[model samples]
Target: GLNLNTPAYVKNAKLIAWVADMVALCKPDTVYWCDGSDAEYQRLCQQLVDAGTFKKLNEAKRPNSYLACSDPSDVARVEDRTYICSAKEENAGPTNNWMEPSEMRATLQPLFDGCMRGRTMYVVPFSMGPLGSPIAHIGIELSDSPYVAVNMKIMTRMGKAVFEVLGTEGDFVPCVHTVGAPLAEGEQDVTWPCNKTKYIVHYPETREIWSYGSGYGGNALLGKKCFALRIASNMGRDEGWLAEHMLILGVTNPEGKKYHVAAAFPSACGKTNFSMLVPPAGFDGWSVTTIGDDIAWIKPAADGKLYAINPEAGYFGVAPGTNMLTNPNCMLSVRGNTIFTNVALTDDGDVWWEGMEQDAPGKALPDHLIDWQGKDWTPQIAKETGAKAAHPNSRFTVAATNNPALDSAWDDPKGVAIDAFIFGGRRSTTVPLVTEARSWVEGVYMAATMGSEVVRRDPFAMLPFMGYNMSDYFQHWLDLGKKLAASGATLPKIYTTNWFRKGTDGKFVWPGYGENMRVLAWMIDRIEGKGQGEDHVTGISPSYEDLNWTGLDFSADQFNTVTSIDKAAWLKELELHAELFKQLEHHLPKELGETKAEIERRL
Candidate 1:
């Protein structure tokens, strides 16, 4: 039996009931809600109606509140901004004192004013109809029913695309929010009181270190729409929010060496770490100003290269793995210069930074370290306060006081062409430290994993849990293959470093970025020049190689440690290396060999 009356069998019955009730009460054709979750259905609806977008879109409704645009573009304006409208009322006809264009304009003025105020743009492309058949779709999230809800659905869908393309697995929950609210009293009052009147605002893209509220939870995606909360339902799938903005910056090393690298990933994936680590520990001779940590505006630069810029004034950093050793500047930045969260107080007893009380929502009371959207953000003074506090959401808000300053991150003076691009996830075995392909056209002649492999008792369920969906991830690899072939940019040196490996000692070992740096240095030097008559060769040191010379700082002993190898020993190793290269040659595309010579000349 179909059991049609059962609640499970009825698709979105409760939501339909709520919409019907709202329609009956408001007597409006269009009703804009937030997202798919109950909180979205409840709180987001009230929030949007309060923000006035719902009311404005409601006013644009046609007969009986039905949405009749065959083309989504027709229903919505897609200029520099976006606008969506629905159908009108039924037998009751237009109300005598119904809102006119002026009134509607007044209603949407906040959103309109806000639309122009943001530094970065959030784009979501999507298509939808009934469950069985697809109807309309657009490049960004838009609405037909409740405005914010439809927009959120689009965001969720785009997030799906972003994660899918990245091969991420796990739960992907959808969220939404209202746009604008007034700035408040003191530095503390910057966030608004929890109210229905406030519209969702994703503005002032960046903030000071202390002003960056807790990670993603307080942002428009998680807080405004409760997408993070709804993610709980999809525990079966891997989850991560797609960033709304992108930024690219080009810098020349202190040695006048130029390199262009893209710093993009889902949240909490070492953006801040990369920004903070000083040379020796970080990329040496490089002035690593953030292009955009939280968001970036990316387009082809004047030099026919893609340039990215950060538009916001704050920092959104994951609380874990940050410390004095890795980023000592953070200590100074936090003391009267930044916000601290989920961090222990310094041993000197100068100040105290707070830690979160709980992870779930509604369990903890809101505090200065928390936001109305149930995000726990510890608001730290941009300078020294010398005191610590408890945080519920384990987040902090600081001013964007750190340099090269937020402004510098965005103002692209000169663009640098991208010379090399390396893409890999935290997986092992599929890749190696350095792989010089036998041919360039064969498309990644030497494909290896980026992360170290984990030897497991059971490979099925346990292996799949390693961050990304393998099948989808492979598809991304395939897509990259096509893109790499089309670009014809330096034959795109592709290599993987399986840095996260379990050692023979039965302990997990991490090959720090320094290891990869050495590999990159070796490759760049080799590819740029070689002794005449020497064909190109690819080589790798196992991720386990301890090039640091027994953990002591650089010394003559490290150099002396290299033992001389007899000709017989060399021949034995050469045989193994030759066979490895032979296999690589077999897999490589023929075009790679033809292109290699040309690319080498340019280098």
Candidate 2:
């Protein structure tokens, strides 16, 4: 039993009993409740540093930052081992691996027994969104790993505030996590204790999460991929809201009016960079800022417009390929009080990754640095052997407020009214630079058809994150349009964008990074009924004259090449889409099928 400064709102008997049962099962030597205070965070950070799990970086260079070289085996999400323990197999869908809940509990119960022996069990109370927001969700995570504690502290709004939001009888997703290592009396501890066998199980019906074996953010910190997306998706479906793996950006046009846009892209599709975009030399007056660079919780408001909230309090995404030129805002976001995992450490205590270059001239890696494996190497050696210092998935976890361009309304409880929605893909041809969908169902079709031919990655870039069957998820998106219109709320105009479109010379058609603002500015214009785009074969796309192309070196020819509808390619892609449509045909909505048929006829 433990006695501490429990909040008055902690009178939820069910929560208390659940904790008690877990306490009996895990059998920790001590129990520590998190206060969500800096003092507690600092203490836990120090504990992790003393345990050799972290290296405190040079505070002067990267203020209040630390680096962790995670176990090489525990670097990324174990998607294969991840499970959706739904009541039935069909509910989990083809996108997720499923197991019977009772069987899973049977397998996991024995492993969780006494898993925290000799360790202190940390009770982490967290909220996925701003506290008190109608859309915000609460959770309580119990874990033995301080690393998980510290990471959760940065990744979520954890601590005392959550108890108030939870109240005496408020609903909260229950999460139980462990590194799956228990110490015997007089036994030595390993730097990173994780079981080789990992299980990330989620019962979406009950909104429960149970994780074991790994300490990675995506795997252990159940609030992230597990709760924020998977469980929340199910909740959204039941409640008529939406839980999408998307980025929301608050862009204020030159007219001084701010419009929020939520966009989705597959992994490594430059989602974060686009969220915190900076205008190029040609476009100076327009301003771009980040609202949320990851997941979005969206619901139709009283006004009928969809409102969205960035559920996570922090930015915990990839570190490599994030450079001053590519995403200067992110570089600034991770500046201080950030956690660097599995990235190279420079001699002067600075961080280095693959895309970092000097004068933007390229190939200017640090002279010497400690690799991700904690081994020393120089540029000479790196060039000779061609071994990357940082893992491809090496990432940084930093507070979203740390971002220089963070929107003032980022944490607003009411959320920002979204004006437009964009879905992008890394296609080399056929797809236009940006195309406006004819309708909401058309938008869903565009989103689904992206990465064309659907080789595992689905539309909205939520293949792995969506909690329910992918087909049902698509239907939810399609039905939301009618629900919004029924209330006289105008559905947002949808745009399908592709900055990664390539020319015949095997060159990028658009100079993506900052110039992407051109596409954004155009989207805003069309949304306001000011600018116009020609109805092309695929969709409505802007002409070269429609963009802020005055100072840009781009020519109309370049635009034509990127946006041209290659009949042969489109016809081939139409055939491939049927393969995915075939699999989803059982649960696929008729509107999506009609839209697909319409596109095929138009093609």
Candidate 3:
């Protein structure tokens, strides 16, 4: 690993092409923040200028911390001791205190070029000082110096050690090498670049393995799809952490013989659970092998459809209270072919079958496993298949599996054509669970999802999985929105879900795993004209007029929230957004009479 303490300065930090060097070595598109300031803009600036490592690390600890250098000429200089940015722009770097989205949109390319210079980079946003040392912070991975690798931190309470190594052609491989902080309460200040951090990056398809570094603070060696500086930090609290990236699920039923379905979740949501879980529809001679669970590198397909391919072969799910009843398929995916994590253990005395036993020194066995052998469970494998004897959490040999796709040599140069794209996040009630957009431009919706109860002060309720350079991500979404509008033969569909609902006692309730998938699938099929109700007035495929809130249940609070939005103001913005969609053959009406009425009724 390149020493974090060593300073490597390359000239020409302004030109985007200059980043080709860093990209050549690191190969990542996303950058992370180790720490930043919240102490009013001015004080933070002075601290950074004085080479205050302690102060700098402290301010940069939260998920909100970011690296934004607006002016390309203003370089992010790495002196002998501390990391500093160009003062060319007013309130550049930590001067803003709040990691504003506007600032990030204004500056990402410059800061990225200055630090990475054509190398793949991953950042850990954290602090190492008096305020809260070893604070669990936000983490992100930059892919090949352009595309972003948005992932979530699963071990929130535990301190994590991140490492990267650069390779030829600006490709980098990034991974969590060590769990320095145990899953105990409070903080655990752990030193990095230790022996425990040694790891081997592997590509099952080629059966190739490469060695990686264990240190923090310096450039790490580069490998094919592997390289970058090491980053480590506590993600603070698990409850309010935002997912570093979002996954859009799209499917096509070409002949209707089988439901060709694809499901993906943002970094932190139960994506693996959804992908592996057997839907209520049950298996119809088809089993779901994970096709890119977290980060999907998508592009147009030869048939002109969107296809998504997953980069990693691991299940990154919530740690607490997850099991077979709630997540039935997790057992098959985790065992024999996958890695065991540090979650809770199962009732059986055997831990090896669960893959909980680890070679990592001092790391305890996972405390839990999704119980699949119980009588009440649905059989994933036929009785004659011998899978009945398998371990609940045993790793799956995904590459060696008997599945047809695994055995075949498959290569489709162009990715699938995107049929529909959706945005998700929790906003209480701003959006709907599913809405047929007038066109693709109106298809985006945010669903706020999380694992804990503690809320942070940031505008976006970020999860541990949200990428470090997230502002760049949102801008990309906006850009995609414009493109979708342009290709207007037909618009894509969009939906949003809170996932958390209130019970009779007023406590929050989470619907079981398969149930959520069923709901999502129902909506998807309905939009494609397969599951519409007889009346076609409601249900999955509701008529446009019926989409209004006029016929649904409503609460006083919900009504007021809808009315509070300024329709006139929104209209102005809508018109402005229309310009972005000009290339499309058709556009939704500038104003929907029913939609406008529904907004009024909600208010």
Q: Which candidate ranks first by lDDT, i.e. highest? A: 2
Q: Write the per-residue lDDT of candidate 3 for residues 346-379, one digit (tens) a residue.
A: 3342223322233324544333332323222112
lDDT of 2 by residue, 1-603 (tens): 234334554777778878888888998888888888999999999998999888899988899888888788898999998998899888888888999999999999999999999888899999988999998999999999898899999889999888877777888899999988899999999888888989999998889899989988789888888998999999999998998888999888778988999998885637898999998877667888888988899989877899999989898889888888788898888889998898999888878888876324555667788999888878787888987889889989898889999999888988988888988887787678899987777888888877732344466788878798889988898888888778876679888988867777888878888888989999989888898878866678988889888567988888888888778988877787788888777698888778767877887
Per candidate, the number of residue pairs that clash is: 78, 0, 112
Q: Stretches of candidate 3 above 4 Å error?
A: 1-269, 281-289, 300-305, 316-319, 343-349, 352-414, 422-438, 445-472, 488-491, 507-510, 531-603
- Alpha carbon lDDT of each predicted model: 0.30, 0.86, 0.29
Write down the worst ten-residue block by lDDT for model 1. Answer: 204-213
- TM-score ranking of the models: 2, 3, 1
Q: TM-scores, in order shown? A: 0.40, 0.97, 0.43
What is the C-alpha lDDT profile of model 1 across 236-321, one tens digit per residue? 12221111222233344557654544432222433444444343444455444444344432233223343333323344344433
State the lDDT at 426 in candidate 2.
Answer: 78
lDDT of model 2, residue 70? 79
Flag the better candidate by lDDT, 1 or 3: 1
For every candidate in turn, the CA RMSD to the true structure comes to 19.5, 1.8, 18.1
In candidate 1, how many Å is residue 194 off?
Answer: 9.1
